[PDB]
Symmetry: C4
Subunit: 218 residues, 4 copies
């Protein structure tokens, strides 16, 4: 209809998208300020009133956007994300506030250069599914072995399957791998390094190949 | 013979290989569950009975695979590995259980994309034999020097040749290289950094070249 | 005029530029010596007198350089920097001395190979503005979440927005990310790793892409 | 002369070079064994007698090699190194033994693949002289500033110019940069991170470019 054309010439207009960008930035600063407990004592009413106005504007904006292109909305991942973050931040007023902080990625969603770069980073991922699965299998296997080997005398670190996964991820990142893990272990299990030095070697060699493999796809 | 043809049309069939894959995954989950001591109190008989059934199936499968292509079996590295892991997990019921956890790499062996990627990672290795030998020689030489220099007043870290190898591998990875090693050393040996700063420099420069050399072979 | 030509055949002469280089090097050594408190007790008058002579020479040199090409001087970034560092080191005799130490980058400014390489390093930067903005937004968002999640029971590290920024930069560099932060946190907040393991993953994946993206522009 | 031809057909023969290689390997194992204090109690006379025989053989070998091609000997870097290490290990029987351990790099010198790879690693270095000089200047400048800023209240780490160089190299490698340095500093100097976060940023950005620049020369 004639009115459908007009609201789409508003929605797909550069200005309306720029306005939702401005609301996003003001809102994000607001969230930066809301951590300041003294600032909150000073301006809780002003900021919270502001929050309510910006969220209502956001909700009606998502509604109009759903109107213009319905099928396109729920098969487009950026609008899918915008829908999902606003819905998350729509519920009546614990961890939900922490997620509400994610509304600021809508600044990625709105800004075309930000879209270009995020889709670039995601387009890198398919190629390394093979190595992510290899590494996941590897971590699972060594985690079970480390749990059954050190989990009893070292419950804090290898006690269960999760704690072992975590200590193996920590060892892979390199963080206190020896003075923190392998050397305290060796006070009781002196050939513990047979388990970790090969583990280090494989992880790094794989992690280095993953980085190499990223490049060649250029 | 006519029967030899039929069992090979089963063995090299997509379905039989997929079945051994399914047994592998169920088994791997089982090994994940067997760490849960309460779950083990609950279902030790069910899981262990399951273990026995899956291992017998695996053994007869390795037998049939050896039948179809004997010479091909012991010159193929993937089947060599499958033979070796099942043989490891075949002995009567300490560290053997920990190895038995390696049966899950048979999931790498069975899955063609997993084969492709592992053979890729191995095909990277020949080219860097030269640098691995250089680095091994380097580590040996500096390990002997560090043992003879700090091994007496620092027995925990450089006392023997092994402890020195380990502290040098730890220093190469970077982990607590200073606050943990070089700075405590300098409380007694104040020009210990003449030994380590050059050591750091050479190791990293070599480690960076090894990464570079990997790429160019593309 | 005839005299303007002569002073420009001095200023743009290889020798005058080499002389200001020599003054820079002598001065830099002087600053190296001035840290030695015993050396300062010995030669405070000689070095400080030297400082005054070299700085006056520098000031009149910047004056003549401004004369030869005025518009060119304040639109050229290297001379802009030379102007700014000498002006910084021109004020009557706390933190100003620490900045005065930056006069030694004038050795970068004077030396053509140094110019070539610094302009190379700067020419790398435009291309990664997109990712620097993405990462800044990311750090802001996770910093607000970490402040509101751990800032109360962990004021030292996530108490305000700044301390959270710092602990997140520290976690990104990898330094004591677990034994130092995430594991002490988990003594009180046991699913704190839901916040950090994804955070680690995104940061590294982005940091690795930033390195990759640098290369391709070759 | 006719005899000069024969000894050169021995010296440049594959067999004579292989023999000095064998002596090198036996000797290197000997040095590995000499760290074992119980093994030394057992076989000090056998090993030391062995040492004397192998070193005399080495000396006469260096003499003959100097004979065949004199000018070529002192302008060739590999033979220069062989001369220098044997001369080092030639003096009458403290730190000299530690250097004597370097005789094992003669295994690099003798082995052609080892020569190829070491000359490759050295051939990488000229191209990065520019950045090594930039980084050295950078380290000098920030070291002077850090000494004058934190050297008094933190003598252990920034007290002199050397301790500052070391703490800056440690911070560059990343090792305990925060929990170990910057955070203890901030207990007294709360805006110390203005000095280190920029320092980190520049170092890494430069260190990443140095790695990139290595590649392109392919
Ligand atoms: C992209 C660049 C981002 C730049 C962000 C830089 C943030 C720096 C934060 C510095 C905070 C430290 C200063 C400070 O002294 O902390 C105190 C304040 C609030 O005081 P507070 O701790 O509430 O005092 C309580 C005292 N009591 C309990 C006894 C009553 O706590 C604060 O000061 C918090 C200050 C809020 C700063 C908000 C900045 C928003 C930047 C927006 C960037 C663009 C967004 C797209
Ligand atoms: C860094 C801050 C994040 C903020 C998020 C903000 C909201 C983002 C949600 C929507 C994301 C949209 C991304 C996207 O559209 O991906 C497209 C990519 C590359 O597209 P493109 O380069 O156009 O090529 C696609 C082929 N074509 C042209 C024929 C269409 O092609 C693909 O999508 C390939 C499929 C890859 C799926 C990978 C899954 C990502 C993993 C999720 C992260 C897990 C964290 C632990
Ligand atoms: C770009 C996409 C990335 C790749 C795809 C997704 C990567 C993650 C897939 C990993 C699948 C396994 C996740 C998992 O095993 O979760 C279990 C544990 C549960 O921990 P929990 O028992 O609650 O730990 C508490 C520790 N304690 C005792 C001290 C209180 O939670 C953990 O401990 C998680 C530890 C890190 C998991 C990462 C393991 C390797 C991931 C795959 C390798 C790719 C490169 C890292
Ligand atoms: C590839 C992705 C892998 C995903 C793996 C994620 C694993 C997460 C493990 C989380 C474990 C922590 C939860 C927990 O509360 O621990 C307790 C349980 C067993 O309790 P338990 O510690 O035995 O209680 C004893 C109490 N007592 C001594 C007083 C009687 O200990 C456990 O909960 C162990 C839980 C077993 C989980 C097994 C998951 C198998 C995933 C299969 C993936 C595909 C394989 C190819
Ligand atoms: C992709 C293939 C990888 C390259 C080929 C294989 C690499 C390994 C070859 C190294 C050859 C030497 C192995 C070796 O020296 O083993 C001896 C020691 C024995 O340790 P031990 O005396 O039992 O240590 C206990 C420590 N303590 C006193 C605190 C209880 O055990 C250790 O300490 C091992 C320490 C790490 C050894 C790595 C040394 C450099 C390896 C070559 C360099 C390539 C990049 C790293
Ligand atoms: C680019 C390569 C740069 C090379 C730089 C190497 C610097 C090495 C610094 C070594 C310092 C440690 C030696 C030492 O024992 O420290 C003491 C001295 C001064 O003694 P001091 O600590 O004042 O004694 C006070 C005793 N008291 C309070 C009881 C009266 O404190 C000092 O020794 C400071 C020594 C000044 C060395 C200046 C070297 C300038 C190199 C110029 C490079 C080219 C510049 C473009
Ligand atoms: C090549 C160009 C580089 C990229 C452009 C510039 C990068 C920096 C842009 C970051 C914008 C935000 C800076 C910022 O948030 O400053 C606020 C805080 C204030 O700290 P403050 O509250 O005074 O901290 C004291 C800590 N305490 C409680 C223990 C005493 O100060 C900090 O904590 C700073 C912490 C590091 C900030 C870096 C954050 C990510 C930067 C963007 C990511 C690019 C790769 C890192
Ligand atoms: C390239 C690959 C290199 C492979 C190197 C692997 C080295 C592993 C070293 C393991 C050392 C730890 C074993 C151990 O229990 O230590 C004790 C022994 C000597 O005993 P010691 O500590 O003297 O006993 C004294 C007892 N006391 C004071 C009360 C009388 O101390 C020793 O055991 C030292 C053992 C010497 C091993 C020498 C191996 C040479 C490998 C040659 C490689 C090729 C060279 C080109
Ligand atoms: C890793 C274990 C080390 C063990 C050492 C054993 C003894 C080694 C001493 C002798 C080294 C000989 C190296 C060498 O010949 O370098 C030649 C390189 C590359 O040669 P090439 O690739 O043939 O190209 C040269 C051009 N051409 C064909 C016309 C001659 O061309 C160049 O030489 C260019 C000049 C570069 C000088 C760089 C100085 C190296 C820094 C020293 C390390 C400092 C440590 C902190
Ligand atoms: C491939 C070739 C590599 C590049 C060319 C050579 C690189 C080294 C050139 C650096 C020139 C300056 C060397 C220097 O400043 O030496 C002075 C100090 C003296 O230390 P000292 O005062 O004896 O320290 C004792 C510490 N204490 C108080 C706790 C007992 O000794 C130190 O602290 C040395 C600390 C590390 C020096 C490295 C500085 C940056 C080097 C250039 C950057 C290239 C990438 C790192
Ligand atoms: C959603 C994002 C997708 C996830 C996949 C992206 C990769 C994530 C990897 C896990 C991150 C931890 O990253 C960890 O960084 C350290 C840095 O010391 C690596 O250690 C590194 O050493 C060498 C030497 O520099 C590198 O060339 C190599 O990349 C890596 O092995 C660990 O091997 C790696 O695991
Ligand atoms: C079976 C696998 C084959 C084994 C060979 C594969 C390589 C294994 C190397 C040993 C693993 C430890 O890896 C260790 O990672 C750290 C990460 O801080 C490296 O430190 C790194 O600093 C720079 C800067 O990022 C990197 O460009 C470089 O790759 C490396 O020198 C150590 O130099 C490296 O030794
Ligand atoms: C003015 C300069 C411009 C600033 C921009 C330049 C980049 C600066 C980045 C911040 C510096 C800290 O750098 C930090 O180094 C560690 C090394 O363990 C990285 O950890 C790394 O793991 C893998 C494995 O090696 C690398 O391939 C990757 O580059 C990186 O993710 C952190 O992810 C990175 O953030
Ligand atoms: C390449 C970039 C280099 C930038 C370098 C910046 C690094 C800064 C190093 C840490 C310096 C802090 O050192 C200095 O500490 C003193 C006291 O100790 C503070 O002094 C302050 O004390 C209190 C606190 O507000 C006030 O009442 C007082 O009036 C004020 O002077 C200074 O404000 C700070 O400058
Ligand atoms: C004789 C040899 C010649 C000497 C020159 C060779 C280079 C030596 C550099 C000094 C070695 C210390 O190496 C130190 O490794 C750490 C690894 O966390 C680097 O940290 C790294 O973070 C990122 C992310 O991975 C890397 O892409 C980058 O290479 C580097 O900045 C430090 O920035 C680097 O300085
Ligand atoms: Ca790391
Ligand atoms: Ca580290
Ligand atoms: Ca490391
Ligand atoms: Ca690091
Ligand atoms: Ca490091």
């Amino acid at each position: 209809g004639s009115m459908y054309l007009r609201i789409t010439n508003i929605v797909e207009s550069s200005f309306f998208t720029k306005f939702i960008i401005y609301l996003i930035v003001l809102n994000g600063i607001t969230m930066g300020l809301e951590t300041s407990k003294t600032f909150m004592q000073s301006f809780g009413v002003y900021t919270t009133l502001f929050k309510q106005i910006v969220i209502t504007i956001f909700t009606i904006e998502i509604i109009l956007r759903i109107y213009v292109h319905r099928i396109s909305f729920f098969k487009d991942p950026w609008s899918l994300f915008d829908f999902f973050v606003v819905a998350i931040s729509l519920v009546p007023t614990e961890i939900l506030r922490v997620l509400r902080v994610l509304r600021l990625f809508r600044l990625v969603t709105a800004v075309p250069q930000m879209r270009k770069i995020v889709s670039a980073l995601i387009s890198v991922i398919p190629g390394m599914l093979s190595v992510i699965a290899l590494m996941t299998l590897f971590f699972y296997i060594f985690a079970i072995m480390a749990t059954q080997l050190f989990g009893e005398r070292f419950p804090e670190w290898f006690g269960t399957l999760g704690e072992s996964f975590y200590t193996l991820f920590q060892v892979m990142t390199g963080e206190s791998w020896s003075m923190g893990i392998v050397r305290p272990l060796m006070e009781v299990y002196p050939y513990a390094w047979v388990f970790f030095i090969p583990f280090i070697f494989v992880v790094t060699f794989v992690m280095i190949n993953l980085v190499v493999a990223i490049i060649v796809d250029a």
